Design a protein around this nucleic acid. Structure first.
Lengths: 852, 216, 456
RNA sequence: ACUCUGGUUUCUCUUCAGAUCGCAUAAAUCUUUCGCACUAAAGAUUUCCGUGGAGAGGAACAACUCUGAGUCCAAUUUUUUGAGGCCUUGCUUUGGCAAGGCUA
């Protein structure tokens, strides 16, 4: 369209023309650890492609991170999409869709939203800190989402201006980082095809603070420009990997001559960089002009009067020029939407590639059926309306076009979760401005307008009166689990509706947020941490609902389990006094629930392979390995339902008629649970006996589902019940001295330190610990305050561990406001939660039985 | 007029050395966690005092906690207590641990730890593996050596003639992380009144062993 | 086959079916696929196997559900549609588009319509719940209801649904909900004899930017002015439609004769010399009035020596004298004087009088206790129109149909309304949920605040 | 590689300046708030301490550093030739044009 837009190097018509060609588009997610330079890198790219936008001499301008809370905190909170046109090394301009994701672990869900609509991942790793917790988590999540992976080793200047390492030691640090990343990838990925090494161009070395971005190819091209006769590709092949250079023969050999010469990387790449940086920071007034002339860089008198940091940025911008190394890395290794469509459909689309529409989407053809898929919901500045952001997988979305939007519950058999909406407008989403466009072809990111009403988290945009076999994309599988639970109410109940509206809005803004209302009319928000919930509540108070809101103290969501089999075979009949079901409950084997959660086993598999797996990995009986019905409450739920009814006593055909009802009851019971209405975890349910009424009208429906839930509850209760606390994994980056002090903090919060290894090449240590989530509130603040701010920690959900106490212990006396001792913490955690949910004071073991 | 000044880096290094007694040699604002201006504003707006921080009269009228009439929301029979929710927790996350966050400024979160290794021995090389740095434990689709790759005689490292470090390189690298009056090399002259020589002294935490009057 | 024979229909109880509030799931806060449970009246989400409504059905044993958007009944545990005409009334309560009932005066239906409980009521004559202090809003809404043209316009959803709106526009929430409110008020068959204005008042609060709250009561005149202006603006789709239903019904044309005046502290010679300045003469500032602001004479202070009560009494024609044409009421802004003569030029079909009671004196606000002596069956305004204007309007005989009256002190005041129920001739006084049969003679005795007259 | 503006220093006047006008920090007045106001907070105004930007004027010595403007390639893959000649068909603007098969 035609509208006012900021001055840019390219032209908007060229940008629109690049969108049509799906071979020149790169969907890239810039992920990494907290404060590793992703946002500054995007800012450098924006400065390169926008002449009028310049970074302040003192404040690191951030084109992304546009939110007020992001600006004040300094921590990226929401993913920012940026569509630019970047020149390659050869000069060929490519269209780049970059989803700048937050680095904080609490907002890892955000990165997941940026991984569904991207084909490639660029992981930013600090050259000083190295591989951290979020880098490992994001590597696992990316290689598990079937995405191409490249690495940008950011902040190499820290190796020069902070650590002051010798160039060979800097090379050793970079090589160690690359090796550790390769080891992580090989550990999380069976295939060894995606080896990452700067020789292959998979790795780029960057300093977004000083705009020093280069790969081996780009810097070899710099050599080619200064000396024409050299071919840059072969030189870049020879630049890395302990290959020494002989200037007597002008040849590169694996054998080191003179026993004192440095590697090719150190001699040709690292040492010139050290010389440039040292000349700028140390010998500016006395010896900067000579080195500037030797490099061909000419600076004005007013430019040479700048401070050292701006002068470094200017000199390195003039030397390295555009970030062409990044473009090479993301062009040669990150598939285009044309190339990368097939893995995306095979992984995310529910119908699979084998379906006709899957084959249609495998081509990513602009002139096909519309199959846009939006995973983000961006609120306007006023906060009233939301724009659904996502990539177009097939067809072409047009402004002012009728559209069928499919929700997360839309299925072919049940199409009720679908709505016909009229698209209002379409924007190409740059960070601080949006380019309104009439249409968006397949393979591009778009901010659809007017489709926000029927969607909360995930959408499937398609065209109406067509695609009658179209299915939805799989909902976002999240890296972590939302645990921290907070109750929210209004200060003035008269303005309750506003808060409710606000809840809806936050439910749209945060992909992993879960807002519900319990039995006691208490509004519940689930988050991944205290910073995440702080940002959520700031949004809920200022952006969406401008009302004053009271927030309860934070509590965690516990799980329920059993530790030994049921004392007696529990049973329940239907209200019809027929259809008797007799079940027992037993704990699962070690790691079986982990196997189920991590998709190692799926109920979608055939009977043969599932039975073989359960017979070989966990040594189950063939009958026991073939009688498994369902996995827990949801798909791949931690619980297991089996029927041990021998065919002699129970007709299998008759039982199969009520199999759906019994499975529904099992799933509902495991989702709710009888202790404190919490998820039942790691419990094996065996159907010992099942009487079934022959007539269809006396079974099924509301008769067998509540009966199944009742018998599940009885089997769970008679078996010794226990509660699972959520245990977070904590990584502390602390100085060497502070390590001891860290232990002290974890002494007061039931924290177990697993390892305290140092950071190779860095003066700090990474103390890893396993702290209870319920005890983690303020632990970050306690650690930073006790150590004068020198120690920083990031906590992420790790596992579920049984609470020491016994929940069903009526002998325990609990004062209303006292931190209870460990031996009965579970007793405190069960009743109080039972009061928060609104259930009875206590639960009896025979409450759901039939005798009483 | 004596209004603008520009200095060469050796002069600024000597000045930074001569003023080392008046500077805490901090290289981060992480020392000022929950103890900076924004944290103090958050504390004042919430009518709460940081231990090391000052105390103010309430910004708004505060209602006694004994006035609330035991709603289901603030029922203590439902609240699970593990650790006392300190004032620091509420200042760090004002919108999570406060029921009425008004005029509260979000405190700056963690900044990356500056790991600048300060050089003590001038005789040592500027780019030297200091013992503070943890030694790195050592241990590739390389091209074959027999191939015919040749480098032209015109080609050499970009700054091969340039020495890696100079006598005044460590001084400049130190000046990178100096306090604000010394981070610069050009600036504007200030009034003698306008320069607080001891402002950073009380902006930092009070020393651990001090009498009651100096802490106040 | 399961349809037309669902056994769980007797489980439905209409005593708990309150459809006057927001249609969101009680568990998930989701407007999408909101299903009302007909056994307990709670709204849940979805209809499939793993929806909140299905879980509630299998948990609380409530096996009957109605789609709040599709108006179709379902039995969820078996998940089959319910087809029975005996349930139709429930749908009519949920979507009571009372086009015909609101076609005339909302109260036009004086029939002793029976609610589900044994509470006979006249459609349109329906009390509004008093959510904290919102009696002024209830009185104003009842005054705007029982107006045949506006009520008829809002009784049909199609009359305003298809008009365009700006994307980020919230004013239209005032329109549709208001229409919804009308269809709830004029419902011939309703489960209860009262209607909750909660949704309409929430829309009013949201649209007015925290003005005219539900907790704190506001002025009836100010709220009526804002509501009429907002209805006129919101019904103009993406542009200022010069002729909306609000303008067609209530707006008239009046001719302001503004005569500037010299400063009184001047010599008489200069005072008459300023008469030739061509600035202190009558001007043509003819505009459109949505309502007439009648200013009562000040309280007589000392009681008259006669046996009459201390309460002053003034005829309707005496306050309706500023608009005769020759009467010159002084208007004095800061350091300037005027003489605003008023002359009506177009009489709207429904005339609105906004009698000025509350005036801010030097220290507090005083409510004028003057009693307006007005007839309730015949008022001729032919003498207040220009001769060239009198010929245009064949009819000028106005009948009072609505009378908003404020009682009590200016701070802790209460609002009630006298509405004329058409079809019958009865006059009903509504105050929140209280509906009394007032005698026609007693209406003139109370302190009239706002009045709505019909031109016939 | 050759020409021509824009110079720097200082004094003064005018105007704008929400820019941390200031990497510093005072005073007064009014209102508000609970105490009962140096030992107290909020809101607002104003005055002082003194800056930045632009323009104008004065006088001191520098006049082209900078900012700029005006101003060595014949042997594959482009610019030191596979280059020219024969025949047939449609129109002949009876010069030849368009296509194909050739010889080189």
């Amino acid at each position: 369209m035609e509208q006012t837009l900021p001055v840019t190097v390219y032209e908007m018509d060229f940008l629109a023309d690049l969108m049509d060609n799906s071979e020149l588009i790169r969907n890239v997610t810039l992920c990494g650890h907290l404060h590793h330079g992703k946002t500054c890198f995007v800012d450098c790219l924006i400065e390169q492609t926008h002449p009028e936008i310049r970074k302040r001499y003192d404040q690191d301008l951030c084109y992304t991170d546009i939110l007020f809370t992001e600006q004040e905190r300094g921590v990226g909170i929401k993913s920012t999409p940026v569509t630019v046109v970047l020149p390659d090394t050869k000069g060929k301009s490519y269209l780049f869709n970059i989803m700048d994701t937050p680095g904080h672990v609490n907002f890892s869900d955000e990165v997941t939203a940026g991984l569904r609509i991207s084909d490639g991942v660029v992981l930013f790793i600090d050259a000083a800190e190295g591989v951290m917790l979020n880098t490992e988590r994001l590597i696992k999540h990316a290689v598990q989402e079937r995405l191409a992976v490249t690495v940008c080793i950011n902040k190499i200047d820290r190796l020069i201006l902070e650590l002051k390492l010798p160039p060979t030691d800097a090379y050793y640090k970079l090589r160690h980082i690359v090796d550790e990343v390769n080891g992580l990838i090989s550990m999380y990925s069976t295939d060894e095809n995606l080896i990452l090494s700067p020789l292959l161009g998979n790795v780029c070395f960057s300093s977004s603070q000083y705009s020093i971005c280069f790969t081996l190819g780009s810097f070899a091209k710099i050599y080619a420009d200064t000396f024409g006769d050299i071919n840059y590709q072969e030189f870049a092949k020879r630049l890395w990997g302990d290959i020494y250079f002989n200037p007597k023969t002008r040849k590169f050999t694996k054998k080191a001559p003179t026993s004192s010469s440095q590697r090719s990387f150190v001699e040709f790449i690292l040492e010139p960089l050290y010389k440039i940086l040292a000349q700028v920071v140390g010998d500016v007034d006395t010896s900067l002009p000579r080195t500037l002339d030797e490099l061909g860089i000419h600076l004005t008198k007013e430019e040479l009067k700048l401070n050292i940091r701006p002068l470094l940025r200017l000199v390195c911008k003039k030397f390295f020029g555009e970030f062409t190394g990044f473009v090479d890395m993301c062009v040669q290794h990150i598939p285009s939407p044309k190339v990368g469509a097939k893995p995306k459909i095979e992984h995310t689309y529910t119908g699979g590639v084998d379906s006709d529409l899957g084959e249609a989407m495998s081509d990513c053809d602009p002139d096909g059926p519309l199959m846009c898929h939006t995973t983000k919901m961006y609120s306007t500045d006023d906060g009233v309306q939301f724009h659904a952001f996502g990539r177009v997988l097939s067809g072409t979305i047009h402004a002012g076009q009728p559209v069928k939007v499919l929700g997360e519950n839309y299925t072919l058999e049940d199409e009720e979760d679908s709505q016909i909406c009229t698209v209002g407008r379409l924007w190409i989403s740059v960070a601080r401005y949006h380019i309104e466009v009439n249409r968006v072809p397949a393979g591009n990111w778009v901010l659809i307008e007017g489709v926000d009403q029927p969607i909360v988290k995930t959408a499937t945009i398609t065209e109406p009166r067509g695609n009658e076999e179209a299915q939805i994309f799989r909902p976002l599988k999240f890296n972590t689990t939302s645990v921290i639970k907070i109750a929210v109410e209004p200060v003035n109940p008269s303005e309750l509706p506003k808060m409710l509206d606000g809840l809806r809005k936050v439910n749209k803004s945060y992909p992993s947020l879960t807002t519900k209302v319990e039995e006691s009319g208490e509004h519940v928000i689930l988050g991944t941490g205290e910073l995440y919930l702080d940002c959520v509540m700031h949004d809920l108070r200022k952006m969406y609902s401008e009302i004053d809101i009271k927030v309860a103290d934070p509590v965690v969501t516990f799980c329920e389990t059993v530790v030994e089999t049921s004392s007696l075979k529990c049973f329940a009949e239907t209200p019809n006094k027929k259809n008797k079901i007799t079940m027992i409950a037993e704990p699962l084997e070690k790691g079986l629930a982990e196997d189920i959660e991590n998709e190692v086993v799926q109920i979608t598999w055939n009977r043969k392979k599932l039975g073989e797996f359960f017979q070989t990995k966990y040594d189950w009986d063939l009958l026991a390995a073939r009688s498994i019905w369902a996995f827990g409450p949801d798909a791949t739920g931690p619980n297991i339902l089996v029927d041990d009814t021998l065919p002699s006593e129970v007709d299998k055909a008759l039982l199969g008629s009520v199999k759906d009802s019994i499975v529904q009851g099992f799933q509902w019971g495991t989702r709710e649970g009888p202790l404190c209405d919490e998820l039942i975890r790691n419990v094996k349910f065996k159907i010992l006996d099942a009487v079934v009424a022959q007539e269809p009208l006396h079974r099924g429906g509301g008769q067998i589902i509540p009966t199944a839930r009742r018998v599940v509850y009885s089997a769970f209760l008679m078996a010794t019940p226990r509660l699972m606390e959520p245990y977070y994994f904590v990584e502390v980056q602390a100085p060497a001295d502070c390590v001891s002090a860290v232990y002290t903090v974890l002494a007061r919060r039931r924290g177990h330190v697993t390892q305290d290894a140092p950071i190779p090449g860095s003066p700090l240590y990474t103390i890893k610990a396993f702290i209870p989530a319920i005890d983690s509130f303020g632990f970050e603040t306690d650690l930073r305050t006790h150590t004068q701010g020198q120690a920083f920690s990031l906590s992420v959900f790790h596992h579920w561990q049984i609470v020491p106490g016994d929940p069903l212990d009526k002998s325990i006396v609990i004062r209303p406001l006292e931190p209870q001792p460990a031996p009965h913490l579970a007793r405190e955690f069960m009743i109080k939660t039972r009061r928060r949910k609104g259930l009875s004071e206590d639960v009896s073991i025979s409450k759901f039985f039939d005798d009483p | 007029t004596y209004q603008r000044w520009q200095f060469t880096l050796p002069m600024m290094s000597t000045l930074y050395r001569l003023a080392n007694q008046l500077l805490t040699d901090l290289v981060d604002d992480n020392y000022f966690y929950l103890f900076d201006l924004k944290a103090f504003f958050t504390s004042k707006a919430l009518n709460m005092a940081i231990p090391g921080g000052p105390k103010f009269e309430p910004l708004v009228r505060d209602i006694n906690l004994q006035d609330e009439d035991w709603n289901e929301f603030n029922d203590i029979n439902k609240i699970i207590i593990r650790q006392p929710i300190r004032t620091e927790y509420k200042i760090a996350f004002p919108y999570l641990y406060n029921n009425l966050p008004h005029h509260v400024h979000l405190t700056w979160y963690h900044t990356p730890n500056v790991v600048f290794i300060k050089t003590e021995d001038p005789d040592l090389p500027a780019f030297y593996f200091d013992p503070l740095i943890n030694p790195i434990s050592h241990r590739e689709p390389l091209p074959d050596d027999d191939e015919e790759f040749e480098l032209p005689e015109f080609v050499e490292p970009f700054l091969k003639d340039t020495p890696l470090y100079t006598d005044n390189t460590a001084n400049g690298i130190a000046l990178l992380w100096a306090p604000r009056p010394f981070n610069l090399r050009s600036g504007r002259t200030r009034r003698a009144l306008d320069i607080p020589l001891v402002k950073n002294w009380y902006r930092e935490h009070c020393p651990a062993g001090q009498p009651v009057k100096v802490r106040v | 086959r399961r349809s037309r024979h669902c056994p769980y229909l007797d489980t439905i109880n209409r005593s708990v079916l309150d459809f006057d509030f927001e249609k969101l799931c009680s568990i998930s806060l989701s407007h999408i696929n909101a299903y009302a449970c007909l056994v307990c009246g709670k709204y849940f989400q979805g209809r499939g196997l793993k929806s909140h409504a299905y879980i509630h059905s299998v948990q609380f044993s409530h096996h009957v559900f109605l789609n709040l958007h599709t108006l179709k009944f379902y039995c969820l545990p078996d998940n089959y549609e319910i087809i029975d005409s005996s349930l139709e009334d429930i749908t009519y309560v949920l979507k009571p588009t009372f086009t015909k009932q609101q076609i005339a005066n909302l109260d036009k239906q004086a029939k002793l319509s029976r609610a589900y409980d044994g509470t006979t009521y006249l459609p349109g004559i329906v009390g509004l719940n008093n959510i904290k202090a919102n009696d002024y809003a209830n009185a104003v809404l009842q005054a705007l209801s029982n107006v045949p043209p506006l009520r008829n316009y809002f009784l049909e959803e199609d009359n305003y649904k298809n008009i365009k709106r700006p994307p980020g526009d919230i004013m239209f929430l005032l329109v549709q909900r208001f229409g919804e409110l009308m269809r709830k008020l004029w419902n011939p068959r309703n489960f209860k004899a009262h209607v909750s204005p909660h949704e309409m008042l929430q829309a009013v609060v949201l649209c007015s930017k925290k003005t005219f709250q539900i907790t704190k009561q506001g002025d009836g005149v100010d709220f009526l002015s804002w509501f009429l202006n907002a209805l006129h603006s919101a019904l103009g789709g993406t542009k200022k439609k010069k002729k909306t239903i609000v303008t067609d019904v209530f707006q008239g044309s009046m001719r302001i004769f503004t005569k500037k005046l010299p400063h009184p502290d001047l010599p008489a010679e200069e005072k008459e010399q300023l008469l030739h300045n061509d600035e202190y003469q009558e001007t043509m500032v003819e505009s459109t009035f949505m309502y007439l602001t009648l200013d009562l004479p000040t309280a007589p202070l000392y009681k008259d020596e006669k046996e009459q009560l201390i309460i002053p009494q003034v005829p309707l024609f005496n306050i309706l004298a500023k608009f005769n044409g020759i009467t010159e009421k002084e208007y004095k802004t800061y350091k300037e004087n005027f003489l605003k003569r008023f002359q009506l030029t177009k009489l709207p079909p429904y005339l609105i009088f906004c009698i000025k009671r509350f005036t801010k004196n030097n220290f507090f606000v005083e409510k004028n206790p003057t009693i307006v002596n007005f007839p309730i069956t015949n008022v001729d305004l032919r003498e207040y129109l220009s001769e060239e204007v009198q010929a245009v309007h064949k009819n000028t005989t106005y009948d009072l149909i609505a009378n908003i009256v404020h009682d009590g002190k200016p701070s802790e005041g209460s609002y009630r309304i006298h509405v004329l129920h058409h079809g019958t001739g009865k006059w009903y006084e509504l105050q929140d949920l209280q509906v009394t049969d007032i005698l026609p003679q007693m209406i003139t005795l109370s302190e009239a605040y706002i009045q709505i007259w019909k031109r016939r």
